[PDB]
Every structure is written in structure tokens, then in C-alpha cells.
Amino acid sequence: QGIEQISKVYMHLPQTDNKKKIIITEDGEFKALQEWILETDGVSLMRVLSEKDVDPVRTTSNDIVEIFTVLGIEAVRKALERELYHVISFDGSYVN
Amino acid sequence: XXXXXXXXXXXXXXXXXXXXXXXXXXXXXXXXXXXXXXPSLQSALPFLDLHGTPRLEFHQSVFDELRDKLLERVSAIASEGKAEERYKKLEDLLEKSFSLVLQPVVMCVMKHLPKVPEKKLKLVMADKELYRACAVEVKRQIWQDNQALFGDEVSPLLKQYILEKESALFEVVQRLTRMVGKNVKLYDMVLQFLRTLFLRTRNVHYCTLRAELLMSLHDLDVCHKFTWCLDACIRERFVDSKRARELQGFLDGVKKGQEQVLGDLSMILCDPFAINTLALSTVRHLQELVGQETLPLLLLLRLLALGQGAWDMIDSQVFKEPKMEVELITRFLPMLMSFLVDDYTFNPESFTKFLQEQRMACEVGLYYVLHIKNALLRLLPGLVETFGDLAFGDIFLHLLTGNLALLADEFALEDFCSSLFDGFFLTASPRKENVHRHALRLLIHLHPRVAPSKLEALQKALEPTGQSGEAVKELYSQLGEKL
Amino acid sequence: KSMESVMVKYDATVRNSINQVVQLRYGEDGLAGESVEFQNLATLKPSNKAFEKKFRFDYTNERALRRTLQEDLVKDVLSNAHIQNELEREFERMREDREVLRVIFPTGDSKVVLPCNLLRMIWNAQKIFHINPRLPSDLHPIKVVEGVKELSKKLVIVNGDDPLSRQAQENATLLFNIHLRSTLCSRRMAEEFRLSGEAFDWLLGEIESKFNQAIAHPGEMVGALAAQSLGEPATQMTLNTFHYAGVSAKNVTLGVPRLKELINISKKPKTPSLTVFLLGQSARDAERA
Amino acid sequence: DDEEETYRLWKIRKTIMQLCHDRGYLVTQDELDQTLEEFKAQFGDKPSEGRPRRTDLTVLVAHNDDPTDQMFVFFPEEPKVGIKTIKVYCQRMQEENITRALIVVQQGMTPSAKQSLVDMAPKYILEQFLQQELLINITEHELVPEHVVMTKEEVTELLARYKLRENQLPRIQAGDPVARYFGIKRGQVVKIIRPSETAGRYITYRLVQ
Amino acid sequence: XXXXXXXXXXXXXXXXXXXXXXXXXXXXXXXXXXXXXXXXXQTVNLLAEWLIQTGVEPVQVQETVENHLKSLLIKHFDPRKADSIFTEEGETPAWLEQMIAHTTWRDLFYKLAEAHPDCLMLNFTVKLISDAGYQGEITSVSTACQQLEVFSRVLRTSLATILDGGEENLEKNLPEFAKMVCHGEHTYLFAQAMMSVLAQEEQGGSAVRRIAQEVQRFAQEKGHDASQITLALGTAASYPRACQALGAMLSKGALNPADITVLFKMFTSMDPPPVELIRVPAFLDLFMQSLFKPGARINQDHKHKYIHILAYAASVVETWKKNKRVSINKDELKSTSKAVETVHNLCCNENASELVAELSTLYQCIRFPVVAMGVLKWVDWTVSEPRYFQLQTDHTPVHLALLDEISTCHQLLHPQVLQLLVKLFETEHSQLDVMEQLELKKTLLDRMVHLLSRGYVLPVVSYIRKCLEKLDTDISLIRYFVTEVLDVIAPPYTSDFVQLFLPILENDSIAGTIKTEGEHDPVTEFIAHCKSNFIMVN
Amino acid sequence: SNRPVMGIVQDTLTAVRKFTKRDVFLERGEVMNLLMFLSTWDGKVPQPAILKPRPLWTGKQIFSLIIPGHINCIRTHSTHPDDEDSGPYKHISPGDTKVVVENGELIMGILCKKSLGTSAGSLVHISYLEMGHDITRLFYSNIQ
């Protein structure tokens, strides 16, 4: 079963709204739907993205070179931005 | 005003309520009634409104003039043009044209009104239609102005052509507004009448805007489609050669065309965009064949197609122009002489003089090779002999193209020779040619040893230039020069 | 040492030592990082009906106009319908800005850094000009609309008139003009702020001044500034300060080594991972998950 | 499996339709997003030696203007494509007058055929794509912003407004998967619209190197 | 002699009086004589229905939209400056005809708008709604109930609605009933007096007493000090000082030990008060608060007095033979006292291995209803502490096994039991593992299945449908609920259970119910029985 | 991080938190001792918050003499109850835990590190932006 280059995958419901699916209701008010997300321990995009019942849009990654093979250079600029803001603002600090 | 069924009764009541007593209760009872609304609200309107206006209910009818009109779209989009709903819409439109002197009937005709047997007759009975002619343009405006209204609207094409002439000396949405109500038969009749009238009167500028209007048929509006599929490569690529070679092969194997090949050659023929495109493609192909060193064969067929294009409008029921396979080498020998002078000067004037005095497509080709210093300075006496040889109209546009190429070059002696060529031919020049000369002289005066003499020559071309536009542009150039 | 030469040139662009453009305007807006504050976009995150209740400036009500405006301005608004058309057009622009913000910010938060603190400037104008907001105000809302439009013309990141420069000026002050429409609209100035005419002229002058002070200075050594701005929190961060999770915890190793793995592009990271979002019903079912 | 194969062929068909539409071609609207069941009806629900086999669904599309050029898309039967397989496609192309084409390889190309694809690049252009590249339209991903190819006139306008050269723009690889998606060649500036949390919108530019 | 009319003939009344006696300068008269500058649009608006006959909808919605626009105009151009004047002037043919025909929402919104003026119009429309057969049904307004003839009849029809409703309608109608009768406290006095006179009868007055108790509970929620009204209605005021003590204590909302010694000196004598003074449920709720909170220690000396007061409240019987008692008994309140004492000791000792140890004695205790209600409140106040679920035995089902015991041995506590379970099920438990949260939800659904087994089924399945449809929980939890319910039930099937259990099963996860059952067939049997019951499924 | 870096260090910060409490009152001599150290004082002793029985100044008045220009900020003290702004007393704080500086004068509230520290939007950051930068140098020196 599954793909290669991957160890045990952990699934969970998120708490912070960065991973919670933020939808816009018909009266225009935002809403945080708490839906199941997976989180692997290896890396292989363009093969997990190919799987059925997987959101091919919001499925990000942790490794940058693998995104640069898959999603290009400007998606790597966005991913490096998000990962760098993550490692900076984990301990509550702020950098502009 | 207008008198409907209830309106005639209203007029009769206004006549019979003018005298004879008839107290207000009986008069108001015999006058009219509102069968929809309740009597309770009509009696509470004095208790609540203090004699208000009920026109907000008519405002709701104006909402019905959209809303049931959308229901008319709900009649139109569900059953795919329902005939019974269309007949009900026609009966309501007849009642609204009889009752209203006609915005709800205007929207009910603009929704969908094809196949109305007394529709065009009912519109011609209300044949003033000044503002209605722009609002009834969904279906009713088609085929009613084909007699004289299309001829009245034709003049704005010439107005936009004059606007483009004045803008080049320094539309898209309107043709779409014409093509909003536009079918195959009306478009064919307008195209045929405008092509006959233009090829009789001028055959100069109307072909370019006709090709631009045919290029504005991209929104799936349905020979002519093959003409659009041909002119897509003319519009898209500016220096298209291999696609142009495929188009020349496609238009060379034509059948016995009953004016369709002549119409295609008319549409290809007179467009400054398309003429410049064909000239640049032919000159790029000539330069590629000079790089191959294999002069005659694909540039010859392109030049022959361009010459057949340029000679279309002189007569009707014609095929093309001759090739002159011996004359082509004599026409392109000065290209080889210019290449030999460039090869000598990067490491003959008499041949170009004799080849420039014996003279259509090859003339414009040699004028479009003028963009690409000893070789040009030697061929320039051949250019003086050419400008003394033919002296045509559009040669000043070729001089403007050479001036754009020289402004890309940035050279002093070439600019002085170009100013000498622009100065020595003020005898039979138009207002546009002198205006372009003054606009190029506004870019003149890089050197201060001849610029005061040209500042005096601006006044020396004011009195001899009896056209007020040329002297007004010279005064404006002097005003812009002092800033 | 990777970025000791990345600076702001005199066309306000960000070029390295060899004149290669890194950014066309500094920080994608042209604003230096000192003169900006955390502000709240009021257009983002109400409902539709709360948005229409709070921003539309309903003109048909008599008594609300009587309470908020002076009677000459009330009959000026109620008489003319051109002014009513312009107020409806600015509410059209605020619905357009709401849709633009909801595309920009899919997460429902609005704490965004922007140069001029507009709510504090409105409150400074109130305290300088001695408003007494119980009384009906005396600024015409068409003066509010036209002053905001002239002000959005005056705030220039990108010079020029050709439409590439027009689009660059539009994009550089997109978010700030959205916030400037949202804070300085007709309804909030009539109802919850109540500035006067001279207070509003002072306000527009102050917004224009404090925006022109926040432009990134040509010559600023942006590269060394950003490298120090990232490396100075590097010493305060710690891999071992965070407690940890006894349950699976996915070895996230945030801190100095993750910053290292981002800084030198490591093809062998210590912990690669994914975040596999499930598509449909499988996102709301533990069994399909 | 056979249902998995018709799902995979339908997703490759969908992604090629979106690729042709984003590249600027004539893609019919129902073809641009058809249902899997519509694909199974039109082609036959058995890729395992049956009716929706390869070479049946070679998609020919023309351009939205200048309708001469076409890139009629190829689907080889074999997993590992080679030169003696692509010369049949070269024969089908030289039978025509059109120079662009896309092949959708299943496994990797033999590298001699990779060199062979470059060995006719001025004559007629061939791009190749693996199956895993075309099971996801990567332009729909949220990390991928809006890439738009710019015309040469807009490039001249860009360089003349900012007074900079093509050497000075920030650049992009030619083997970039979004660049491979749009099929851009070397020296062809790509404007990129992305939302910024500090200005709203930011348009950057990537010349291709 | 004007002859200047387009469609002003409909305004032929006030024109005519301005026509014969015009005089002076009749410029305005002539201008208003031709101020109807449009055509015959009062008839062409009737022709809009004829155009709608060609439209999509030739129905009664067009006249409804016209009447709605007329109502919006009459509310927009409402004559609020001369509202009471126009009310008090004519009122005879206009309001009577309007309340005859268009009494749907017009005068109701008019009395919702201002309601201080137009007393002639308010009185005429109120009397016409009194002339309406079913009631008071138009005047459904929390501030238009300030007229006595209106409010009495509205109270009557709402009581008829609730008393024909039942226990299911007890949750739905009671705020819509209680927002009226707690709006004014004088209306509360009127309503509670009617509750008293109706609950004088033992032939169905218990539901009236129940509705009175929920209205009193809503009055305590919203902010009344309504216990003094409650004691003033009661017979308890016939014995003054006990009722005065209850008045001060229920005005403080807390237990004073000295106050219960004052009560206890009056009880357990040879002259007890009539037992309906102590049966008031807010008083027993304050007993549960002061006695069975996990904190809130009681100082060991008047403790037995507390337990004896609760035992006398929930124990003794009487025989009111013409407003006198002749045979009461006290022979089970010693067992009740022993049970509540053992339970308060088990809630005082706060030692959880001991809670597991004496669980057989605690199962002996919850045979009693007051014990079970008290343990239910204690487990509510224990389990709903945040960060409780950190002792984990089988994801801590011990207190939930006490929920199963309370649900087993009684039936009236089942709404409170379900309320506790759906309060815990909606509560997101932070700092737990997500699988651990999911198994906690599985345990709560096991408890809901146990409530479903003991008869109380329809609110449980109604909540499961409510949380599948509205504001959805995890689908796997509903699948587990369906799996555990269908592993225990068997035909015959009552039609309400089929009607309520069908859409959760057939819509939204058919497939997950059957994986490996085999020996007893899955949902297929319920589908077959559902086809065999109904009339096809419909 | 578009915030100040200076802030108010430890002993000045505890002494200014104890200073700006509600129950701090100052005798006339102690006021005249404190106002001797303001560099930016225009020589006008303010009107006392308590005139009778004894002329008795509140520490927030001296702190309003510190706060320069006319700056306006609303901050929350570190022990502000989160359920205070829900119910009543959201403008009359019973714990004095809602900092309002208004028209350059400290209306109310106790100044913890969330008011004077290096957090963004603090009193010193707004004193930097609204007033000058020499004025903030004076503000730091006067506080210390």
C-alpha cells in the first residue's frame, strides 16, 4: 500500500485556523470548518497530489527542493516565505 | 397623447365630466376602478397617505417591466424560443404600443421579437424612433435602416477615418455596438454595398477598416469565414512569411471565382497595415534569399501576390496581374548593388539610377528597403531621381518610414540629406506631407549651423503654403520650439 | 554576506550590486519598515448585512440625517440625486474592495501593517478640533468622497502616466486605498466619527504627509538591514525551549536547525513532511481518512 | 486495473485541455471540463486492450487567433518511448505543416530520444510530459500564482519604462514546470500576478533563461 | 367646466368640492386637477396581471406583491404626526374594512411601529382581532400585549397550543410563550394567578403547574425575583414565618444554615406545614447546588438537618381529604436520609479509587430519584470541569456508567441526561489527542445508544439528525451510532422511529455501515422493512 | 518588527506601575520635588485632584505632565480582566486596568510593560510617531 519514500503518516484535526478550512458563508461571514488533515513523515509530491480524494490545491509541503521539482520557482518563493515565517513566528516573535 | 382601450374611456369621461353636474361619488364610481388592489387599502390611503400618488405600484409595474421580462426570458430560455409565449409577447407588445406612447414595450421587443408579421409594420408606423433607434436595436433595428439609416450611419466611418488621419499626423466598441444587432443577410448587404461604393469612389481607406470589422467577428457570429481564417495571420503576425507562403499557396489554387477571389484581393489590397505587413514580409524574404544567395522561388510569388493585390480595384471581373519573370531580376539588382556597396564599406550608383528611372509592388519594396553610410550616400542620387521620376501620394508615407528608421539610426548627415529631400519637393505636396515635414523638422535642429536657416524657411514656407493648416502647424511648431 | 549590496535605487526599485532587480518596489509596496503600524481592515470580516448596515450611508431616512448632519447639508443630500448616485458608487467600490480583500486574505484576519494609523489620526483630529460629537456635523459627505479620491491621487509610489505605471501605482497602494476608503467613508464620518470640515482638511493633509514620510528612501541598504532583521531573532530562538508533545509530535525541529535548512538549501532535511488536505466527504469522515 | 486506467486517462485528458486553454488555444467548453462518465461514454471504459486505448485520443487543437499552428497531442502506447517511436510522430507531423506537438510519456524517455527532441528544435518543436506531471494542473495549486506570458510589444514597453535590460530581470528556468506548462522558450518575459499581504497585488516579471 | 383630466377622475371627490367652490386663484386647483399626468395606469396596473398571464406566473403572488408594496408605502408614508388624530377622527369604514380584508400584518406592523399613539386605531384593530375567530393570532407582539382583553385571550390560545403540544412542544413553544408573560411583571402576576386557579384541579392541572414552573424558571433566568410572587400564590403563606424564611432565602438564591434550622425547627414536629411548600423545584435545585457541588463543603453539624429536609421533601405522602390531612407517613425517609447521606459522603470524600470501590453502594443509592438527580448534577459539575479527561481507564467511563445507572433506574431524568450528553458532545476538548477525542465521542454515543435502549429514543435520533444536517459533526460518529443502534434493535417498528431514522441512514454514507457483519445482516434489513412498512418510500 | 527597541527598563517600570495606580497621592512638597526633574515642564503646577481637605495630587497628574504634546492611546494593563469589556464598567474600570492617554493627558489605567515597553502600539511608539524623536528622547529621560 501507499507510495515509497514515506514512513508512518499521522492524521489530526487542526486547531489554529491556518490549517482549518476557512469558508465564506452565503451571508458573507467567515467560518472555520475543522476537517481532517494528514501529515506525513517522508516527502513525495506529484504522487500524493495524484491520489484520489486528496485536495490537489492546498496540499503544501515541508521540503523546498521537492516543491522546486514539482511546483516551480515562484511557488518555492511562496513556500520559503511561509516556512520562514513559520520558523520565525513559532515562538511568538514578529519580523516584518 | 396616446389613447388605449382604457384611455379612450378616460377621454370620454374627461369629456362627459366637463359638465352636467354628476356629484363626486357617482363621478368617481363611473370614472374607473382598480380591480387588483383592495378597497380597504384604497380607503386607508386617505387615512394614511393624505392623498398620495399610486405610481409606486406603477413602479412595481416597471419592476414587472424587468421581472416578467425575465419571465419572458424564462419563456425564451426554457422551451428554446416558445411560439405560444412569443405570440403572447407579441400581443402584449401590440397592446403596449397602442397604450403607451413605450419603455416596457421597448424592453419586451428587446427581449426577443423575431418572426413578428406586423412587427416591422408597427415599428414603421412609429417611424420617428430617434432615441428608439438606439434602444430598439436588439432585433427591431435590424433591416429597417438598410434602406437609408445605414447610409446615414456610414458617415461616422469616414469621421473615424479622418480622426485616424489626424492622429497619425502627430472604432472597436462602436463596431461591436453595430454588431450587437447583426445577422448574415444584413452584414452581407452592408458589406457588398460598402465594397461597391468604396471601389467606385476611393478604394483607399475603407478596406482596412472593413478587414478590422471582419476581425471584430470573433464572438461566434458565423469564403467569408475562410477570409477571416486567412486574415488572422495578416492581423496577428507583422512579419509572417511561412504562414504568408501557405496563404499564397492557398489563394493561388482558386477556382473560377464569381467575384469572390476579387473580393479577397480587394480585402487584401488596400490596408496600410496589411500593405506594410506584406511589404515587410517580402523584404524580409528578400533579405533571407540574399543570405542564401539564391535570387530568382517564394519571394517572387509573394511579390506577384502583392502586385495582384495592389491592382484589384481598377476593374471588375479580373483575375490578377502579370509576373514579369525577366523584370524581377532587374528590379532586385539594386538590392545586390546596395549589398555590394555595404560589403565594400564594411570590410554602382548608375545601375540604381537606370533601374530607378524605368518605372508598383517593387517600388514600395525598394522604398521599404530604404531603412536598411557610403552606400546610402551613393544611392541617394538615385533616390533624388526616383523622387523626380514618379512623385506619387504615399511616397511621403515611405519617407516617414525612412525618417522613423533614421530616427532609430541617429545620424547627422543622413538627417541633413533627409531635410534636403523634404525641402526640395514642396511643389505638389499635400497638407499631410508638409505637416509631416514640419513634424520631422521639429525633430530637426540637432546642429546649430543650418537650424536658423530652417527657422527662416519655416516662415519661407508659410506664405507659399496657402493651406491654412500647414501655416498653422508651422506656427504651432514655432510655439512648441520656444518652450 | 549573501545580501550586503541589495539596496534601494533612485527609481525606488531594489537592485543588487550588478543592477539586477530583486523587487520592483521595496517590500512590494515601496514603504520603509519604520513608519508602519498594525491596523484593522474594517471591510474584512463582517457579514453582508452588517457591511451594508455599517458602510452604505442610507440617505432616505430623514431623522438619521437630521441627527448626523446640519439641515442645509440634509436638504442638499435629500434634494440632489447626483450626490445620491455618487454615494451609491462609493458603496459599489467598497463591495468591490470587499471582494478583493476576501481574495487576498482567505484566512479571516485583518491585522495588517500599513503606514498611516488612520483611526488614531481621526481621533487626533477630534481632540484637536474639539468636536463634541453629540451635535450634528458640518462636513458634506461629497467633500468626504472627493477628498478621499483626490488623496488617493496624491499618494504616489510609482510616477508616470503610461498604464504599466498606472497599474504599478494601483497595485502598490491597493491595500492602503482599500483601508482608506473603509475608514474615511461617508457613513462612518457621518455617524461614528463626526469630523468637521477644517478637521477633515487637516486630516487629509496629515494622511498625505505621513504617507510621504513612509516611502523607502533611495540609498537605504535594505539587504544588510533584512539580513540583520532575520539573524537577530536567530540568537533568541531555541530548539529546546519548547516543551514538547509526548504524542507523535512529527519531529518538527523548529528553531536554529530549521532556519539552517532553509538558509542553506538542504536536499537532506532532518524532517521532511507534507500536509495532505483531504478533498471532500473524506475530510469530514474519520473512516475515509 | 481498468477503472483506475480510465480515471488516469481522463485526468490526463482534463489537464491537457486546461493546459491548451491556458496556453491560448481553441478548447471547446464542454471538452474543457467533461465528466468522467462522459469520457467513459465517448471512449469506452476499458483501457486494458480495448476501446479507450492510446492513440485514439490524440487531441488536435488550433490557436485562438492565427488558426494555422497546432500542437496535436501525442499519447504513446509503450511506457518507455524511444527514437524509432517518435519518428513515427515526426512522420505524422511532416505529413502535416505544423511544428508544435506534445507527447505524454508513461515512464521516462530514453535519453538518446531526449537529445533527439532537441535535435529538431528549429525545425519543429516537441515537448514531453510524464504521467505524474499531468495528473494535477499545477496552476490550480494555491502556491502557484498567476503566470501570464507577455507579448514582445509589452516586453519593449516594460524595458523602456523601467529603463533596464533583459539581463537585469529576475529570471526563471526553461525546465521550470510552470514554464514547461506554458511551453515558453528562452527569452520570453512572464508577468506574475500574486497577492501580497503588504500591498494587495504585486506583479513581478521573469525573463526565461 | 375644467375638462383637464387624464386619470384624476378617480380623485373626483376632493376635486369636485374644489371645482364648484374654486374661486380666487385656482392655479393650484387646476394643477392638482391635472396632476395625474400619466395615462390610465390604475387600469394598466390591472393589465399587468394580463401581461403576467403571458408571463411565467399568472398566480396570486402578483396581487400579493402589489399589496406588499402598498403596505410598504403605508409604512413608509405612515402619518406619524397625525396618527392618533386620523385614528380618533374617522375610524368607522376604513379600519373596519381593512381588518376585514387585509388584517394579515398591516395593523400588526402599525402597532409594532410606535404603539404609544393611535389608541383609537389600536383599540379598533385590537377589537377586530378579538372579532377574529382564532386568536390574538395577528397580534403576536411582545409589546402590544399591554391591553388586558388582548393579553388574556393571547394567553389562552398559547396555553391551548402548549397543552395540546406536549413534552416535545415544551422545548419549542415555551420561550415563545415566556417572552410575553415575563415582559411585564404585572403580566407575570396575572399569568401565575391563572396558573394557580387552573392548578386548583387534580384532573390534569399537573401540566399547568409544570408550565407555571418553567415560566418561573425563565423569570429566574431573565432577572425577576419571581419567588416572592410564587410564594404569594401558594398556600405556604397560610403558615407565615416558614414562607417568610423561604422568601428571604429564595430572594438570596443561596442556602443559609441558620435559615434551614429555622425551617427544621418547624418540621419534624406534630404540626408540619402542608408539604407543597417544600416541593418547589428551584428550592430543591438550590439544595443540589449547595449540597452536591464537588467543592462547597458543608460544616458537619446541620448536615443531617439538610438531609432530613431533602428526605421530607422527596419522601412523604399525604391525603388531602377536603383540605385536611389525616394519614401521612415517614417510614421511608430514613432510607432516603441514609441514601443521600451516603451519596454526600461519597461526594465529600473526593477519592476516586474509593469511588470505584463503593460503586455497588452507589448503585444501591441511585434506585432513589432524588439521589439520582443529585448524582446527575454532581457528575455534571465534575465531568464538565475543563481539563478533566486526564484520568483515563477506558477513556473514563466510570461517571458515564453512573449516567447509565441513572438512565436505567428512572425515566423522568432522561431529558437532563440527554442534555448533559449533548453538552459534552458539543464541547471540544482541548489538549487531548484527536483519536482520543474521537473515542471519547464514541463513548458518549455508546451512552446515547443506552438512552435509546430504555425507551427514550426520539429526541436522541432527532439530535443525531440535527447534527448530521445542521452544523455537522464527524460522519464516523454518526456511522458508529447507526452501527450500534442497528446491532441491538429488531422489528416491529413504530412509524415515527422509521420516519426519523430513515434520512440519516439513506442519505450521506450508505456504504460505511456494512463492512464485516455477515451473521446478522446490516442496514439492508432495515431498508427492506422500511419498504414493507410505508407506501413507496413515502 | 516596526516597534520600539528602547522601552522602559525594570526598576523605572515597576516604580511607574506603582506610581500610576489610583491610590497614589502626593503632598505639595513631594510634587514640587518631582516637578523639579521634568525637563519639559512649562512652570505651571497643575490643579490638584483633591483640593479639600488637603491639596493632594494624584500620580497620574504628574504622569500627564510627563506625556508630551497631545497624543492619544488606549492600551490594557497586564492584569486587565477579559470579562471586563463584556459587561458594565468597560469605561469606568474598577481595577484601573484600562490605560487611556487622551489629549496628551493620562486619563486612566496603570502603565505596565504593555503600555510603556517595547510592544508595538505602546505609548512610546505613538510618542515617536505623532511627536518627534527629540521629544521621545525627552520623554524617556523625564520618565526615568
From Swiss-Prot, chain B:
InterPro entries: COBRA1 (IPR010405). GO terms for biological process: cell population proliferation; negative regulation of stem cell differentiation; negative regulation of transcription elongation by RNA polymerase II; stem cell differentiation. The modification N6-acetyllysine is found at residue 454. GO terms for cellular component: cytoplasm; NELF complex; nucleoplasm; nucleus. Keywords: Acetylation, Nucleus, Phosphoprotein, Repressor, RNA-binding, Transcription, Transcription regulation. It is found in: Nucleus. Pfam families: COBRA1. One of its GO terms (molecular function) is RNA binding. Its main location: nucleus. Widely expressed. Expressed in heart, brain, lung, placenta, liver, skeletal muscle, kidney and pancreas. Essential component of the NELF complex, a complex that negatively regulates the elongation of transcription by RNA polymerase II. The NELF complex, which acts via an association with the DSIF complex and causes transcriptional pausing, is counteracted by the P-TEFb kinase complex. May be able to induce chromatin unfolding. Essential for early embryogenesis; plays an important role in maintaining the undifferentiated state of embryonic stem cells (ESCs) by preventing unscheduled expression of developmental genes. Belongs to the NELF-B family. The NELF complex is composed of NELFA, NELFB, NELFCD (isoform NELF-C or isoform NELF-D) and NELFE; the N-terminus of NELFB binds to the NELFA:NELFCD subcomplex. Binds RNA which may help to stabilize the NELF complex on nucleic acid. Interacts with the first BRCT repeat of BRCA1. Interacts with KIAA1191. Interacts with NELFE. This is Negative elongation factor B. It comes from Homo sapiens (Human).
From Swiss-Prot, chain E:
One of its GO terms (molecular function) is RNA binding. It is found in: Nucleus. Its main location: nucleus. GO terms for biological process: negative regulation of transcription elongation by RNA polymerase II. Changing residue 265 to M: Reduces RNA binding. It holds the Pfam family TH1. Widely expressed. Expressed in heart, brain, lung, placenta, liver, skeletal and cardiac muscle, adrenal, thyroid, kidney and pancreas. The keyword Transcription regulation applies. It comes from the Eukaryota. The keyword Kinase does not apply. Disulfide bonds: none annotated. Belongs to the NELF-D family. Essential component of the NELF complex, a complex that negatively regulates the elongation of transcription by RNA polymerase II. The NELF complex, which acts via an association with the DSIF complex and causes transcriptional pausing, is counteracted by the P-TEFb kinase complex. (Microbial infection) The NELF complex is involved in HIV-1 latency possibly involving recruitment of PCF11 to paused RNA polymerase II. This is Negative elongation factor C/D. The gene is NELFCD.
